[PDB]
A = this chain, B = another copy of it.
Amino acid sequence: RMKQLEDKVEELLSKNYHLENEVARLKKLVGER
Inside 8 A of A23's CB, which chain B residues have their CB?
Answer: 19, 22-23, 26
Inside 8 A of A29's CB, which chain B residues have their CB?
Answer: 30-33
The chain B residue with its CB closest to the CB of A7 is B9
CA distance A32 to B26 in the complex (A): 10
Inside 8 A of A9's CB, which chain B residues have their CB?
Answer: 5, 8-9, 12
Distance to closest chain B CB from A18 (angstroms) = 8
12 A-B pairs with C-beta separation under 8 A: A1-B2, A2-B5, A5-B6, A5-B9, A9-B9, A15-B16, A16-B16, A19-B23, A26-B26, A29-B32, A32-B33, A33-B33
The 10 A-B pairs with the shortest beta carbon distances in the complex, nearest first, are A29-B30, A8-B9, A15-B16, A22-B23, A26-B30, A12-B12, A26-B26, A5-B9, A19-B19, A19-B23
